Design a protein around this ligand. Structure first.
Ligand SMILES: OC[C@H]1O[C@@H](O[C@@H]2[C@@H](O)[C@H](O)[C@@H](CO)O[C@H]2O)[C@H](O)[C@@H](O)[C@@H]1O
Ligand SMILES: [Ca+2]
Ligand SMILES: [Ca+2]
Ligand SMILES: [Ca+2]
Ligand SMILES: [Ca+2]
Lengths: 707, 706
């Protein structure tokens, strides 16, 4: 059952608003807090910028002695007086469109070149981009923590202060992503060499996996440049594995330091990945936290949602992100550390009537808490803005604390949440579909991404044809997940790593989007799933290689599949649907042994089959489709109906999205119109005269039923 | 002064709908045409696919002998019976999501390897991609023309047929754009060599310009791979010039063959470039047609507008494109050969209420005619779709001629246009701002584009810091042009090539977005402009190089400018605006003798000046800004107000966009709400109105005689 925040042994919907004390006239701090409280928010959230408080090396001001807005201590006391809990975020990085991402100018001037993140040629990637594990960086970070952490410790909830949560640093790795370049600092390269020796033990074992001919570990260099050989792909794959251990070591060092101050509050981190109003790359960024989330059950990750608009063009991003966070972090609530309010960019408008729908859609899509970012506009003091004087536009409050149009939208959404939170937080959706999350397909931020400058991964040079980024973006994120949401079929996402078979068994169908490679553990898990009675849908490929592109045919043999890869027209027929456009000329052509052929190439060769195996069912399609045609939705619909899965409602307009959330007491129907059309429609429960609804463009309705 | 289509000696708003007979049940051809006519549309437009009609080599069906939807003759007859003019588009390429882009399968099977576009290794780029000047391709094209062109000729309006216009081929060069790959067919490379020999005359002259080390023209190889040296940049620059001449040679061969059949109707071509609902790349595609537009005053280019949605996210794209086409094609009306109706992509919705506002915005932004693409949905016959069974979604009519939501929107907009066309077509905007179009910055489709994944141009490798695509997309298209439209300042665009000094004197300001390179002819033109009394705004660089990156400091010397390039904070102050975020660390720091400093680095070095030169005024900014902050709109506004330029209206809500269009007698005020907010505002000349989200209002004002 559901994960949710709890206050006083009852479900609590975390409603926070971001208010930057350092960007607001301190004579107006109280008015901002009062107006936030009056929306029904229970929490306020702020960065504590290292640059703002360590005004010169070893010169600290938290009391407003050198600038009134340096009076952190007073802001904390005002939070307590106005009955708001406080989330504090002291960095060292805050980003936050603050000069030098929040690092002091004096620090970046003073640090040696080996404090910085370095490219393949030894050059500084960016004058504000440190190497996370630089000894110099960590020494200064610790001296900053020595001053700000005693203040945070004294003002924690357990000492009757307002502070309930603290974020460690900010969006770890967001610059290795954005800058479009990875850190070849020698501290990093030496840690990588240690990681490889620990992983492989002998150069002979490494040479056997990579198919390389090194005489010693001293001959192994950090991979750089384009992947041309499978041995380059192997080296980069382990480099990805290493960076996940690297970020875990960084956050582990910050956490150990923080705990030494008697800070026992909840620790948080925040997930980047939205850009241009979609989040198809966020799954790659959350995959960079795989080792933190396994090692730190006490650090809760939240999402940084930046939709910019709310339409069918991005409707699927927030649900797919909320589902993937749940998959990687199943023991904590799904929540947004930064939940768009106003816009960071003047030229990229944020309409109250878009964001209001986003807020309701987020509830439909399972969000359990959020921090409106930004609730309050700021004015950068003293030239501190990265890109201009004003921080955010079209917020709930302007910097002067005037109510703007979003204020009433947030009050309306908060009112509904506070009325309903006791039941709403306990509601589930009935998912009969599970979609597999295979993390290794996402481990490409060094070699293949939307932000990366040079494409380093070209699978055709490795004798492959299914690119893992193309598969996870277009076949999974924009394809299957977009398709299921559009068709109003509930799905859950499961992390396949150390996945318990007992968790998969509750679903009517398990859907796996597969490349030509998949590890032995996952091939074995899916084999057992089907033999024991599971129903598996697998496309576009039966894998035949492992994560190092060495032979592994476990699943192919356990399923009694024979296939050859042949070129044909992109168009196939599947389940009687003609002219299904597929992504590749190459297809898997299956022997029809003990199977029903259900998809055919233009030469009528078999490119999909259905089989019974043990107590289970297998459907394999040897071709790739996402959602770029109507035939693709017809095909997803056909596949779902193979196990007689039904939608919760009959709705007369197929372009209306709904979510039914229920517990024992209560049912919530969320209707979402992601289209620029006033829609009049009727619906009824699949279970047992119809109700008529009119919905405005880009709008929502919520119906509560008492059961 | 305005350019517009004419019918019966009066202004005529060309309203066409695209209806693909080859994709529609012939029993329903008359129904589609009657419903199109009933919207007030006057013209219908279609491809005539070569693959569809030459069913096997030298076997032609135009009469539905082998499939009823091959009855082209009957469709043409129906157009006439239903009182519609017809636009025909017989290729040879049609694209149109048709298998093999409209070329016959039997042709692609039969052609020799030397008929195909080849990569630098001599490998076929794509089995459906021919070399445009292949002898074998033009031979088979001519044999297609020998059968379809006598039918088109017989059905011209001249012979009380319906045919009024014909498109030659389709988006010439589009495949080099989409792939980032040039045709290295030896026949193309031979024509390139001839182009280079013709241009430079001797290997010594080419070596002096390129700084190459060739002993003869025999050493010369077509450029390929990344640009590492200034000499590679030179070679690639001329390779782009060559492709513009090559496309002109191709369309000239088609044109002359067409004219040989007594076809005297108006000839057209079409311009692509919209990507994900914005058009910042479309100017690059306009630039590929520079030589066609110079040499064929009688071929009318129309735009392929694909906005997908209508909001502030893309509001500036259509105006910037319409203005640039006007600059390049001043003697023809700006029109949309493909004007979005429905969506090519099922997952990319096209809402009737969005497109209705796009159609009215298009009128505000000077469009004189359009062809709804697609008015009618199609079903691909017997697997001949590139993609699935269906061609377009959310159209005016489905393939079965069912009316869809867009139908009533088109009928409403068409009623307005017909009511107003006689006056509306003769209106212009009063532009006091002129923005220079310098085509060489756009000549990059083989080395730097939004569609080219692996960038071949990296200007830092050449000792430069201002990339021409960054300049033209972010500083010009999404920056200055977006800013002026947002601020409701009218602008015009002028082609700086062979530009008449007398045309520039009409304007109060000329804005030049300059890289470190600019040819001598443009440097001299801008020198004379200011010296004779013009007011020039120039940023982010005084250029010091020509198009071949050789020294050329004519403008710098004529204006008494001296500068050092120095690194500083991205933020500057300009005209007392603090914290103006600029694109580059590197800025020009100007000597201020005989000058007024008006912009400063964080350390107070002078990165902008104003000065008097002869009778005119110069404003130089040594930094790059587009529109990514409110300070950028503040800076554009202050720059415009240096020469006392005023908006036509005071409108109380700054986020309402307006366009005042007038002639001697008539004024139209177009109000455009690109925002998801009901807005109430008032207006007066330099009075109270409510506009729905993503909507519009048009007010008419009669002008009083004096
Ligand atoms: O949309 C891409 C990502 O953008 C980040 O915003 C950064 C901002 O944090 C930073 O202060 C400025 C200046 O360096 O650059 C922006 O691009 C967001 O934090 C991410 O959530 C987002 O995915
Ligand atoms: Ca001090
Ligand atoms: Ca030389
Ligand atoms: Ca005009
Ligand atoms: Ca001077």
């Amino acid at each position: 059952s559901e994960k949710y925040f709890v206050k006083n042994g009852q479900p609590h919907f975390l409603i926070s608003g971001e208010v930057h004390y350092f960007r607001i006239n301190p004579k107006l701090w109280r008015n901002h807090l009062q107006l936030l409280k009056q929306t029904g928010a229970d929490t306020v959230s702020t960065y504590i910028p290292w640059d703002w408080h360590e005004i010169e090396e070893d010169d600290f001001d938290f009391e407003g002695k050198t600038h009134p807005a340096r009076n952190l201590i007073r802001f904390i006391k005002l939070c307590k007086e106005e009955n708001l809990d406080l989330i504090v975020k002291p960095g060292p990085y805050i980003l936050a469109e603050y000069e030098n991402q929040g690092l002091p100018s004096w620090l970046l001037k003073k640090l040696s070149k080996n404090a910085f993140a370095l490219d393949e040629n030894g050059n500084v990637i960016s004058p504000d981009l440190v190497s996370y594990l630089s000894d110099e960086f960590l020494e200064y970070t610790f001296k900053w923590y020595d001053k700000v952490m005693p203040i945070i410790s004294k003002h924690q909830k357990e000492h009757y202060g307002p502070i309930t949560m603290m974020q460690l640093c900010n969006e770890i790795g967001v610059f290795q992503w954005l800058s479009g370049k990875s850190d070849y600092n020698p501290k990093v390269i030496n840690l990588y060499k240690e990681f490889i020796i620990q992983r492989y033990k002998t150069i002979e074992k490494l040479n056997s996996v990579y198919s390389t001919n090194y005489n010693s570990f001293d001959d192994l260099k950090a991979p750089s440049g384009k992947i041309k050989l499978r041995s380059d792909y192997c080296a980069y794959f382990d480099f990805h594995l290493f960076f996940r251990e690297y970020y875990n070591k960084y956050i582990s060092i910050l956490k150990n330091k923080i705990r030494s101050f008697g800070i026992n509050i909840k620790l948080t981190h925040n997930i980047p990945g939205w850009i241009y109003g979609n989040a198809s790359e966020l799954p790659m960024l959350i995959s960079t936290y795989s080792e933190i989330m396994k090692n730190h059950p006490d650090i809760i990750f939240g999402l940084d949602h930046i939709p910019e608009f709310v339409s069918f063009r991005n409707a699927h991003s927030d649900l797919a992100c909320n589902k993937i966070l749940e998959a990687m972090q199943p023991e904590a609530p799904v929540w947004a550390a930064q939940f768009q309010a106003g816009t960071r960019e003047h030229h990229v408008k944020a309409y109250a009537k878009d964001l209001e729908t986003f807020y309701i859609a987020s509830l439909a899509h399972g969000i359990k808490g959020f921090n409106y970012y930004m609730f309050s506009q700021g004015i950068n003091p003293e030239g501190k803005g990265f890109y201009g004087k004003t921080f955010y536009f079209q917020t709930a409050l302007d910097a002067a604390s005037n109510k703007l149009a979003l204020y009433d939208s947030i009050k309306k959404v908060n009112r509904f949440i506070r009325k309903e939170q006791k039941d709403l937080l306990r509601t589930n959706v009935n998912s009969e579909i599970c979609v597999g999350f295979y993390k290794p397909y996402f481990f490409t931020e060094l070699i293949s991404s939307q932000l990366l400058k040079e494409k380093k991964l070209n699978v055709e040079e490795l004798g492959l044809y299914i690119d893992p980024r193309f598969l996870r973006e277009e076949i999974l994120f924009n394809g299957l997940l977009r398709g299921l949401q559009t068709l109003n079929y509930n799905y859950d996402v499961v992390d396949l790593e150390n996945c318990d078979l007992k968790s998969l068994t509750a679903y009517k169908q398990l859907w796996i989007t597969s490349a030509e490679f998949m590890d032995a553990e996952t091939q074995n898990l899916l084999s057992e799933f089907v033999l024991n009675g599971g129903n598996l849908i697998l496309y576009p490929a039966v894998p035949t290689l492992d994560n190092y592109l060495n032979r592994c045919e476990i699943l192919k043999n356990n399923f009694g599949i024979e296939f050859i890869t042949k070129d044909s027209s992109h168009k196939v027929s599947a389940f009687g649907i003609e002219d299904v456009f597929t992504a590749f000329s190459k297809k898997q052509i299956y022997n029809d042994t003990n199977s029903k052929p259900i998809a055919f190439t233009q030469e009528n060769e078999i490119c999909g089959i259905r089989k019974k195996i043990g107590k289970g069912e297998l459907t394999i399609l040897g071709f790739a489709f996402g959602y770029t045609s109507d035939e693709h939705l017809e095909l997803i619909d056909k596949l779902v109906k193979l196990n007689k899965i039904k939608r919760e409602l009959f709705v007369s307009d197929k372009d209306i999205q709904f979510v039914v959330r229920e517990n024992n007491k209560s049912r919530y129907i969320f209707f979402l119109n992601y289209h620029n059309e006033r829609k009049t429609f009727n619906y009824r429960k699949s279970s047992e005269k119809s109700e008529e609804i009119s919905i405005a463009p880009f709008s929502y309705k919520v119906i509560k039923e008492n059961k």
